[PDB]
Design an enzyme around this catalytic site. Structure first.
Site, PDB file in Angstrom:
ATOM      1  N   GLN A  81     -20.736  11.807 -10.656  1.00 23.01           N
ATOM      2  CA  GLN A  81     -19.958  10.823 -11.363  1.00 23.01           C
ATOM      3  C   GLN A  81     -18.484  11.161 -11.187  1.00 23.01           C
ATOM      4  OE1 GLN A  81     -21.036   9.867 -15.406  1.00 23.01           O
ATOM      5  NE2 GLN A  81     -23.014   9.140 -14.605  1.00 23.01           N
ATOM      6  N   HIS A  99      -4.983   1.223   8.093  1.00 25.63           N
ATOM      7  CA  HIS A  99      -3.821   1.486   8.936  1.00 25.63           C
ATOM      8  C   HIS A  99      -3.916   2.903   9.512  1.00 25.63           C
ATOM      9  CE1 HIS A  99       0.699   1.408   9.783  1.00 25.63           C
ATOM     10  NE2 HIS A  99       0.427   2.723   9.728  1.00 25.63           N
ATOM     11  N   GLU A 100      -4.206   3.886   8.660  1.00 27.85           N
ATOM     12  CA  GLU A 100      -4.258   5.265   9.127  1.00 27.85           C
ATOM     13  C   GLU A 100      -5.427   5.480  10.087  1.00 27.85           C
ATOM     14  OE1 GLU A 100      -1.529   6.475   8.615  1.00 27.85           O
ATOM     15  OE2 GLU A 100      -0.940   5.692   6.632  1.00 27.85           O
ATOM     16  N   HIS A 131      -4.737   4.325  13.533  1.00 26.08           N
ATOM     17  CA  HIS A 131      -3.988   5.245  14.397  1.00 26.08           C
ATOM     18  C   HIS A 131      -4.951   6.098  15.217  1.00 26.08           C
ATOM     19  CE1 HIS A 131       0.061   4.372  13.490  1.00 26.08           C
ATOM     20  NE2 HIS A 131      -0.033   4.713  12.210  1.00 26.08           N
ATOM     21  N   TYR A 167       4.377   7.651  20.085  1.00 25.80           N
ATOM     22  CA  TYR A 167       4.931   7.258  18.797  1.00 25.80           C
ATOM     23  C   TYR A 167       6.455   7.299  18.816  1.00 25.80           C
ATOM     24  CZ  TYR A 167       4.258   6.398  13.809  1.00 25.80           C
ATOM     25  OH  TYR A 167       4.159   5.826  12.560  1.00 25.80           O
ATOM     26  N   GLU A 201       2.421   1.181  15.500  1.00 26.42           N
ATOM     27  CA  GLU A 201       2.518   0.823  14.093  1.00 26.42           C
ATOM     28  C   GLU A 201       1.991  -0.577  13.804  1.00 26.42           C
ATOM     29  OE1 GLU A 201       3.363   1.895  10.985  1.00 26.42           O
ATOM     30  OE2 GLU A 201       2.785   3.683  12.046  1.00 26.42           O
ATOM     31  N   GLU A 260       0.707  -3.314  -0.825  1.00 24.95           N
ATOM     32  CA  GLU A 260       1.036  -3.948  -2.085  1.00 24.95           C
ATOM     33  C   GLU A 260       0.311  -3.265  -3.239  1.00 24.95           C
ATOM     34  OE1 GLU A 260      -0.443  -5.505   0.443  1.00 24.95           O
ATOM     35  OE2 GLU A 260      -2.465  -5.733  -0.443  1.00 24.95           O
ATOM     36  N   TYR A 316       2.196   0.323  -3.865  1.00 18.66           N
ATOM     37  CA  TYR A 316       3.641   0.466  -3.856  1.00 18.66           C
ATOM     38  C   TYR A 316       4.246  -0.002  -5.177  1.00 18.66           C
ATOM     39  CZ  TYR A 316       8.275  -0.045  -1.800  1.00 18.66           C
ATOM     40  OH  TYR A 316       9.586   0.071  -1.508  1.00 18.66           O
ATOM     41  N   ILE A 370       6.681  -2.798 -10.274  1.00 18.25           N
ATOM     42  CA  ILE A 370       7.235  -4.051  -9.782  1.00 18.25           C
ATOM     43  C   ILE A 370       6.129  -4.908  -9.171  1.00 18.25           C
ATOM     44  CG2 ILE A 370       8.943  -5.092  -8.278  1.00 18.25           C
ATOM     45  CD1 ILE A 370      10.261  -2.189  -8.190  1.00 18.25           C
ATOM     46  N   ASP A 408      13.655   7.032  12.544  1.00 18.64           N
ATOM     47  CA  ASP A 408      12.266   6.593  12.477  1.00 18.64           C
ATOM     48  C   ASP A 408      11.677   6.537  13.885  1.00 18.64           C
ATOM     49  OD1 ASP A 408       9.884   5.444  11.281  1.00 18.64           O
ATOM     50  OD2 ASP A 408      10.725   3.440  11.561  1.00 18.64           O
ATOM     51  N   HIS A 416       8.578   1.889  12.513  1.00 13.22           N
ATOM     52  CA  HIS A 416       8.177   1.136  11.348  1.00 13.22           C
ATOM     53  C   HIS A 416       9.068  -0.082  11.096  1.00 13.22           C
ATOM     54  CE1 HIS A 416       6.496   5.156  10.376  1.00 13.22           C
ATOM     55  NE2 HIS A 416       5.510   4.435   9.878  1.00 13.22           N
TER      56      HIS A 416
HETATM   57 CA   LIG Z   1       4.754  -3.024  -6.533  1.00 16.89          CA
HETATM   58 CA   LIG Z   2     -18.092  14.445 -11.966  1.00 18.00          CA
HETATM   59 CA   LIG Z   3      -2.308  -5.985   2.043  1.00 20.64          CA
HETATM   60 CA   LIG Z   4      -3.956  -7.357  -1.033  1.00 20.76          CA
HETATM   61 ZN   LIG Z   5       1.343   4.104  10.841  1.00 21.12          ZN
END
Ligand SMILES: [Ca+2]
Ligand SMILES: [Ca+2]
Ligand SMILES: [Ca+2]
Ligand SMILES: [Ca+2]
Ligand SMILES: [Zn+2]
Ligand SMILES: [Ca+2]
Length: 316
Positions: A61, A142-143, A146, A157, A166, A190, A193, A197, A226, A231
């Site tokens: 659990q 995304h990861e 890669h 990269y 990317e 989203e 992040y 907000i 970068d 990115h």
């Molecule tokens: Ca946010």
């Molecule tokens: Ca547990």
């Molecule tokens: Ca999304």
């Molecule tokens: Ca979404």
């Molecule tokens: Zn990436």
């Protein structure tokens, strides 16, 4: 790690309950034997040594707040594995059912996730900019994309190759998000992040310029930050992919959308058959055109839409 396959239950970062595949051998481990050679999730225990300890739990659990990032990393890696297998007939990231490994609770206050060449790594965030990054299915996918790229095209990269690398990760992260069909959108990150907000994200595919990223080749970043803007300039490709799928008119160029399934098939083919480590944007266009040609024919709408989309973003 030798033991009995079972199914546990926990809650993820966003508070949602989910079933997860575990392995029992004295403890219950985050080891999913149902997918390829396994999905393994590790506790990095706020350190930077990797992978850390295979996640062990006494009762199968996983409702403790410390457990949540592990639950989501483990679950969303499975979803991503299923997407590639079921949609693209690809067995894990190497095409030969390589074990997928993730570590969570990496470092302290760490506002990033990454693929390091061997495994996925997720920070917890600082609680203001980010909450634990594995709570975003698009981030996870995304990861793990890669890793797919590393075993296929091998896009370096840096510079344009890196921006393509990317973008591919954003594209497939989004496609996985739509495959799982939980609040899918064309935004990246989203769910994890800025918990303070509403309505923002790390990057937008539908409108990269929303966060200052370029949406046309004329606005590409040419400096050194970068890794040469990997990115940042990804936004040019992201916008093209959005246009291919969804359609629209962008800088006066009109694109008939062909939908997400075809988008996925075209970009998967391009990635696995035509792109190389040093591919630039112009070569991506050629690869995507060729891919659509292979799949749908040289006089298809699909080919036309790919051309229109790259014209829209100023990529010849
Ligand atoms: Ca946010
Ligand atoms: Ca547990
Ligand atoms: Ca999304
Ligand atoms: Ca979404
Ligand atoms: Zn990436
Ligand atoms: Ca603890």
């Amino acid at each position: 790690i030798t033991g009995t396959s079972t199914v546990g239950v926990g809650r993820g970062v966003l508070g949602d309950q989910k079933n997860i595949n575990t392995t029992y051998s004295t403890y219950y481990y985050l080891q999913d034997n149902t997918r390829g050679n396994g999905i393994f999730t590790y506790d990095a225990k706020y350190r930077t040594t990797l992978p850390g300890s295979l996640w062990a739990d006494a009762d199968n659990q996983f409702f403790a707040s410390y457990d949540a990032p592990a639950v989501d990393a483990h679950y969303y890696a499975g979803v991503t594995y299923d997407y590639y297998k079921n949609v693209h007939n690809r067995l894990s990231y190497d095409g030969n059912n390589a074990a997928i490994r993730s570590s969570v609770h990496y470092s302290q206050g760490y506002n990033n996730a990454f693929w390091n060449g061997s495994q996925m790594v997720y920070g917890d965030g600082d609680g203001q900019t980010f909450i634990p990054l594995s709570g975003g299915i698009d981030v996870v996918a995304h990861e793990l994309t890669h890793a797919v790229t590393d075993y296929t095209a091998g896009l370096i990269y840096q510079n344009e190759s890196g921006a393509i690398n990317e973008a591919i990760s954003d594209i497939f992260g989004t496609l996985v998000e739509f495959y799982a069909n939980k609040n899918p959108d064309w935004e990246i990150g989203e769910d994890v992040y800025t918990p303070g907000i509403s309505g923002d994200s790390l990057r937008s595919m539908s409108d990269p310029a929303k966060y200052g990223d370029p949406d046309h080749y004329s606005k590409r970043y040419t400096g050194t930050q970068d890794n040469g803007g990997v990115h940042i300039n990804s936004g040019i490709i992201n916008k093209a992919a959005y246009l291919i799928s969804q359609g629209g008119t962008h800088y006066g160029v009109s694109v008939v959308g062909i939908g997400r399934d075809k988008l996925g098939k075209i970009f998967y083919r391009a990635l696995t058959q035509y792109l190389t480590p040093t591919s630039n944007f112009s070569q991506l266009r050629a690869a995507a055109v060729q891919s659509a040609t292979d799949l749908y024919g040289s006089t298809s709408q699909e080919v036309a839409s790919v051309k229109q989309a790259f014209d829209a973003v100023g990529v010849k």
